[PDB]
Ligand binder design. Structure first.
Ligand SMILES: OC[C@H]1O[C@@H](O)[C@H](O)[C@@H](O)[C@H]1O
Ligand SMILES: [Ca+2]
Ligand SMILES: [Ca+2]
Ligand SMILES: [Ca+2]
Ligand SMILES: [Ca+2]
Ligand SMILES: [Ca+2]
Ligand SMILES: [Ca+2]
Ligand SMILES: [Ca+2]
Length: 184
């Protein structure tokens, strides 16, 4: 547009809290669409939690975000339910990949507009090995994530494999870009 966006080795993060129930992806997306973010942050190391007693309460969000919490724009007030919306880019070579995500509650990850990892409901801590997807051309791929907590425990760690599920890595500053330019 007319405003420069910060270039960092991470995704652009937004946190939203609510006192309504989050049951599914559409509920969290409606929350995101309903207001300005309760806080913004840089999501440079996307391995959050685990903790207890509601992500949206007290300092639980800070604890959940860990290393990334130092970039919070503000300390949100309490809510019962809450979640994050992350957007930016991830450097991937052409090839085949799959996510394996540990989470409480649900989430959705999309790459180049296509969902590649989805849990459309609340759940206690579970790890799902998602189906494989292909990247046609090497470079920075567009990626967005949503995750939420309806209450209770909370964790979010979406790991990626490039080698058919033999090894997995966290998405972090090695490969993330907020704008699709290279972070130095
Ligand atoms: O489905 C029930 C589960 O819901 C999760 O949101 C919560 O973190 C768990 O502790 C358990 O209550
Ligand atoms: Ca801009
Ligand atoms: Ca919004
Ligand atoms: Ca707080
Ligand atoms: Ca941590
Ligand atoms: Ca930090
Ligand atoms: Ca709730
Ligand atoms: Ca929960």
């Amino acid at each position: 547009d007319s405003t420069p966006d910060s270039l960092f080795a991470g995704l652009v993060g937004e946190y939203y809290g609510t006192n309504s129930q989050l049951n599914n992806i559409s509920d969290f997306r409606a929350l995101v669409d309903s207001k300005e973010a309760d806080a913004t942050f840089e999501a440079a190391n996307i391995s959050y939690g685990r903790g207890s007693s509601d992500v949206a309460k007290g300092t639980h969000l800070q604890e959940f975000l860990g290393s990334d919490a130092s970039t919070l724009s503000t300390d949100p007030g309490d809510n019962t339910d809450g979640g994050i919306y992350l957007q930016g880019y991830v450097y991937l070579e052409a090839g085949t990949y799959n996510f394996k995500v540990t989470a409480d509650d649900g989430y959705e990850i999309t790459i180049n507009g296509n969902p590649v990892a989805t849990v459309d409901n609340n759940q206690s801590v579970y790890t799902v090995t998602h189906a494989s997807f292909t990247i046609s051309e090497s470079g920075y791929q567009a990626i967005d994530m949503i995750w939420w907590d309806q209450g209770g425990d909370y964790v979010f760690q979406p790991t990626l494999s490039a080698d058919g599920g033999s090894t997995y890595f966290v998405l972090d500053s090695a490969i993330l870009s907020s704008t699709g330019e290279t972070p130095y």
